Design a protein around this ligand. Structure first.
Ligand code: HEM
Ligand SMILES: OC[C@H]1O[C@@](CO)(O[C@H]2O[C@H](CO)[C@@H](O)[C@H](O)[C@H]2O)[C@@H](O)[C@@H]1O
Length: 154
């Protein structure tokens, strides 16, 4: 699968708005993930004990983890599909150390889409959401292939 340049521009135009406040977007996305799919919180040994949305919002550790994830994803998106180098360390850590199944990458992709739809209706209409879905599907397809090369079914 290959995105067109027009599709990449829709992706990068909404990402530019995320970048006004990466920390706040990361909080919203992780909280949505943990509320919609509580099993995913168990993978974060550093804050898996958090019990409520209020505790999640107050956690500086959770905020920093959200910034780190969205910054890595932004760098991938800006490569417009030419992301082989960026996926290597990420696939290795997520397959081998953190043990994150592809299904959980689907869950975080849904959380990203949900939050962008809520926060950015001016830059996240139907065509823009479809382009972002196609970019996240490409990311997950390529990471899944790397997982398999690395010895993890995912
Ligand atoms: C867009 C998808 C994601 C991106 C770009 C991403 C990126 C990152 C980065 C850059 C790190 C730090 C370096 C590393 O260890 O590789 C990290 C750490 C981590 N990631 Fe992800 N991640 C993603 C999705 C997920 C998901 C869905 C989970 C769990 C359900 C997860 C679990 C973890 C854990 C447990 C750590 C260690 C966190 C800590 O230091 O406390 N990641 N991730
Ligand atoms: O590059 C591997 C890995 O490191 C992270 C932080 O966990 O990003 C760091 O390295 C990038 C490439 O050199 C820099 O652009 C970035 O500023 C730096 O923090 C992850 O994003 C990435 O997967």
């Amino acid at each position: 699968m290959v995105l067109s340049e027009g599709e990449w521009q829709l992706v990068l135009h909404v990402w530019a708005k995320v970048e006004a406040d990466v920390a706040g977007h990361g909080q919203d996305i992780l909280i949505r993930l943990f509320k919609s799919h509580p099993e995913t919180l168990e993978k974060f040994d550093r804050f898996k004990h958090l019990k409520t949305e209020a505790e999640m919002k107050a956690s500086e550790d959770l905020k920093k983890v959200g910034v780190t994830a969205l910054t890595a994803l932004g760098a991938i998106l800006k490569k417009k599909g030419h992301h082989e180098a960026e996926l290597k360390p990420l696939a290795q850590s997520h397959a081998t150390k953190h043990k994150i199944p592809i299904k959980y990458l689907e869950f975080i992709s849904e959380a990203i889409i949900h939050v962008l739809h809520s926060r950015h209706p001016g830059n996240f209409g139907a065509d823009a959401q479809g382009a972002m879905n196609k970019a996240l599907e490409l990311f997950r397809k390529d990471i899944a292939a790397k997982y398999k090369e690395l010895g993890y079914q995912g």
